[PDB]
C-alpha cells in the first residue's frame, strides 16, 4: 500500500484436489473487504481422566 | 463438539520485521541452505477450576 | 502482602491494528452482533525452586 513500514499479509487457502468437492465446508467471503475465510474445522473431545 | 474456526485473511498487525532482519531472510533464501515455513495454530481452553 | 500496582495511562506500545483489521473492527461494530470489551490483567510470580 504505502510505504514499506506498512507490510501486510494476506492468506487465501486453495482445498488438494478438487476444491468443489462436497466434502469441504464453504468458506463465506469476508463481509467487509470481500475475500474468503480461512476455515479450520476443529473436533474437540470433551472428556478427561 | 465441532466449532467452525474462521480466522480473516488480511494480517492481524503489520509485519513487524527489521530491514537488516528482512534482508537476513532473503540471503538465508539465496542459498542452498534448506529453511522450513511455520504453521502454528494454537487452541486454548477456558480456564478450568 | 498488600502492593500498589500502579500502570502508566499512556499506551505502552502503539497500537499495532491493520488498517484492514481496524476496518473490520468498525464494520463489526456497526451491526447488532454484539462484542465484549477485554480487560485482562496477569500476576505473575517470581519463579520458585
Same mark, same amino acid.
Given at each position: 500500500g504505502k510505504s514499506q513500514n506498512e507490510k501486510m499479509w494476506i492468506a487465501t487457502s486453495e482445498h488438494p484436489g478438487?476444491?468443489?468437492?462436497?466434502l469441504w465446508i464453504k468458506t463465506a467471503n469476508t463481509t467487509y473487504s470481500g475475500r474468503p475465510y480461512l476455515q479450520v474445522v476443529g473436533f474437540i473431545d470433551r472428556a478427561f481422566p | 463438539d465441532i466449532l467452525i474456526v474462521r480466522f480473516r *485473511?488480511? /494480517?492481524?498487525?503489520?509485519? *513487524?520485521? /527489521?530491514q537488516d532482519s528482512r534482508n537476513a531472510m532473503i540471503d538465508k533464501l539465496s542459498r542452498n541452505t534448506s529453511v522450513n515455513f511455520e504453521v502454528s495454530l494454537e487452541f486454548t481452553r477456558p480456564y478450568d477450576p
Open positions: 478438487d476444491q468443489n468437492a462436497k | *485473511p488480511e /494480517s492481524e498487525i503489520y509485519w *513487524p520485521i /527489521s
